[PDB]
Amino acid sequence: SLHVFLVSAPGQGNVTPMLRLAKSLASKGLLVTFSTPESYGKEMRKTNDDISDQPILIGEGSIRFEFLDDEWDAYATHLERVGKQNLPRMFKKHEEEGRPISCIINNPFIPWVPEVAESLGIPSALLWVQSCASFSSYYHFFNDLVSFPTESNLKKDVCLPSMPMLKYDEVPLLLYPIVPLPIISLKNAMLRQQKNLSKTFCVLVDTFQQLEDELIHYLSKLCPIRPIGPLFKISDCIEWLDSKSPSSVVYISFGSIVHLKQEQITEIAYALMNINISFLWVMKPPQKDSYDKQHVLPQGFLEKVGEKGKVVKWSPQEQVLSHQSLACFVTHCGWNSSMEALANGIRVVTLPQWGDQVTNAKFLVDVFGVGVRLSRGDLEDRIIPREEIELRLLEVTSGEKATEMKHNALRWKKAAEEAVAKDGSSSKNLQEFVDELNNF
Ligand SMILES: O=c1ccn([C@@H]2O[C@H](COP(=O)(O)OP(=O)(O)O[C@H]3O[C@H](CO)[C@@H](O)[C@H](O)[C@H]3O)[C@@H](O)[C@H]2O)c(=O)[nH]1
């Protein structure tokens, strides 16, 4: 019935939640138009045959794919410029066909979208694609409410409300003073998103109330949040895994962006060879425009390790992480992977790299209690050697608190599944958002 337009920044980290939310809304019986820049839509339309220029009927609703014309930080202003003109182009064609948009939902890395929305008098909504503690970090940074590291004091602790104390290198690294050249682009977009929050009536977050309970209430009277996660639940690999014994495979994957250093890759392989543990390891091939090059393994690696180890280029990570044969998840602690691990009951080994990964790894290890810390990310600037890698793999699988960390994980999978059930907090939140879309 209701035409709700969704628009994502390019990239797995942003498209996966927007699309997951799109499927949620369509299931709730709405016309949902997902939109992403064409240069990126090109790459998911080649790999997908059901991204097929018809609505995919979901529940009582449907999902049409109207990619914004990319005409393609130099890119950031280009996407803004092109987009601020071509977006209303799409809201005229749509309106003048009897189906006009009643809400635009964007993610932070296109923070100008709310402006365009309010320019046309369309209500603007924000899908936050990180944790509520990541939101709270940015909100308090932008509004200058709590003290943060400065060039004058690069190592300052930070005390945010209803959060553990974070060390200088546990707050999302986009807020760190020492920021490389391109990293400034995303920094401003996050801060630009904090600015336009005034122009937004609802902030949706892929978290569940039990996971970040006290922070969500604190923000409910400051900058209210709507937890509607885990979105992925609300909305050769397997057979090989089907042939292992339960709780025995080390699964390793660092998402679609992180490309570790060769030296770091080598210490992981020797680590896995040494302790002779079963593993599934995603080693992402690079972009064919070099930039950074394909990794290599030790010689005879695959043949020394044998049936115990398996290297793939990409993985059905949702299917993998629900698999009883997994023992742990060496993760870069992206939020989409952190939520997948939490809602599947998987213990983690944290190797965060940049952005909010350091925060999420702080929480998984010290707050959520579901894993072991392996590294501290980019400000640490240290090749984690094979011996501590072997060390954390034994702590998380057979150490003293291994079963305790397992129990913790199970209870978070229990609590994640309550929230997504028909009457749970997140299902209710999501319906009350649908309840508010209609009423206005
Ligand atoms: O082999 C793989 C590896 C990953 N995934 C999927 O890829 C996504 C990974 O997302 P995430 O865990 O969020 O990793 P990144 O792509 O690095 O996410 C980026 O965007 C997120 C939202 O801004 C931030 O939390 C991260 O810091 C940023 O790196 C998840 O849906 C995984 O299931 C696969 O299907 N197969």
Q: Residue 125: what are its φ and ψ, rounded to 5°?
A: -125, 150
How does DSSP assign 191-203, residue by residue?
HHHHHGGGG-SEE
Counting atoms of ligand 1 from 1, which one is nearest the CA of 312?
Answer: 1
Q: Listing from the earlier edge strand, what are the strands of the sheet with 278-282?
A: 309-312, 278-282, 249-253, 326-331, 348-350, 371-373
Residue ranges of the annotated binding site are 130, 314-315, 335-337, 340, 356-357
**Residue 394: half-sphere exposure toward Cβ, Cα within 13 Å:** 10
Three-state secondary structure call for residue 436: helix
The response to whether residue 319 sits with its C-beta less than 6 Å from ligand 1 reads no
Q: Could you count the other beta carbons within 10 Å of the beta carbon of residue 32?
A: 28
**Residue 105: half-sphere exposure toward Cβ, Cα within 13 Å:** 26
Q: What angle do CA 33, 73, 108 make, to 5 degrees?
A: 40
Is residue 74 within 8 A of residue 62, CB to CB? The reply is no
Q: Which residues, other chains included, contact 384 with Cβ-Cβ below 8 Å and sequence gap of 6+?
A: 264, 267, 351, 374, 375
Is residue 202 within 8 A of residue 437, CB to CB? The reply is no
> Taking Cα atoms as reference points, which of 418, 430, 420, 254 lies closest to residue 336?
254
The resolution in angstroms reads 2.1
The response to whether residue 335 sits with its C-beta less than 6 Å from ligand 1 reads yes
**What is the whole-number distance in angstroms between the Cα of residue 260 and the centre of ligand 1?**
15
Is residue 8 within 8 A of residue 33, CB to CB? The reply is no
385: β partners: none
The response to whether residue 80 sits with its C-beta less than 6 Å from ligand 1 reads no
**What is the whole-number distance in angstroms between the Cα of residue 315 and the centre of ligand 1?**
12
The response to whether residue 337 sits with its C-beta less than 6 Å from ligand 1 reads yes
Q: How far apart are CA 31 and CA 100, in angstroms?
A: 10
CA-based max dimension of the chain = 65
**What is the whole-number distance in angstroms between the Cα of residue 337 and the centre of ligand 1?**
6
Cis peptide before 230 (omega within 30 of 0): yes
Is residue 408 within 8 A of residue 348, CB to CB? The reply is no
**Which class does domain 237-399 fall in?**
alpha beta
> Taking Cα atoms as reference points, which of 171, 184, 122, 176 lies closest to residue 151?
176
Q: Please give the distance of CA 139 from its chain centroid, rounded to a whole number.
A: 18
Is residue 359 within 8 A of residue 171, CB to CB? The reply is yes
DSSP β-ladder status, 3-7 and 101-106: parallel
Q: Which amino acid is at 17?
A: P
Q: How far is CA 228 from CA 68, 138, 207, 272, 425, in A?
A: 26, 20, 6, 37, 8
Mutate to test the pocket of ligand 1, among 322, 337, 342 (most ligand atoms within 8 A of CB): 337
> Taking Cα atoms as reference points, which of 417, 30, 414, 425 lies closest to residue 226?
425
Q: How far apart are CA 226 and CA 126, in angstroms?
A: 10
Three-state secondary structure call for residue 153: strand
The response to whether residue 336 sits with its C-beta less than 6 Å from ligand 1 reads yes
| Alpha-helical runs (H) found in 120-275 | 132-143, 183-195, 213-220, 231-234, 237-242, 262-275
The response to whether residue 355 sits with its C-beta less than 6 Å from ligand 1 reads yes
Element at 81 (helix H, strand E) = helix 74-95
Residue ranges of the annotated binding site for UDP-alpha-D-glucose are 130, 314-315, 335-337, 340, 356-357
Q: Which two tokens stand for residue 327?
A: 């023992």
CA dihedral 306, 311, 317, 320 (to 10 degrees): -10
H helices, E strands: number in the chain? 17, 14
110-124: b (≥16 Cβ within 10 Å) or e = bbbbbebbbeeebbb
**Residue 345: half-sphere exposure toward Cβ, Cα within 13 Å:** 16
Three-state secondary structure call for residue 95: helix
Is residue 216 within 8 A of residue 132, CB to CB? The reply is yes
Is residue 4 within 8 A of residue 28, CB to CB? The reply is no
Q: How far apart are CA 273 and CA 305, in angstroms?
A: 6
> Which CATH superfamily includes the segment(s) 3-234+421-439?
Glycogen Phosphorylase B; (3.40.50.2000)
Q: How far apart are CA 43 and CA 47, in angstroms?
A: 7
Q: How far apart are CA 245 and CA 192, in angstroms?
A: 49
Burial of 292 (0-12, 13-18, 19+ CB in 10 A): exposed
Method: X-ray
Residues before each break in the chain (C–N > 2.5 Å)? 72, 235
The response to whether residue 16 sits with its C-beta less than 6 Å from ligand 1 reads yes
The response to whether residue 334 sits with its C-beta less than 6 Å from ligand 1 reads yes
Q: Which amino acid is at 101?
A: I
Is residue 48 within 8 A of residue 75, CB to CB? The reply is no
Element at 116 (helix H, strand E) = helix 113-119
- What's the residue count for the chain? 440
Counting atoms of ligand 1 from 1, which one is nearest the CA of 254?
Answer: 3
- What residue owns the CA closest to ligand 1's atom 2? 315
Is residue 126 within 8 A of residue 105, CB to CB? The reply is yes
Burial of 201 (0-12, 13-18, 19+ CB in 10 A): middle
Residues of the chain with CATH 3.40.50.2000: 3-234+421-439, 237-399
Counting atoms of ligand 1 from 1, which one is nearest the CA of 11?
Answer: 16
- Cα-trace Rg, the chain: 22
Tokens 């609703």 identify what position?
Answer: 61
Q: How far is CA 98 from CA 34, 91, 94, 95, 288, in A?
A: 18, 11, 7, 6, 44
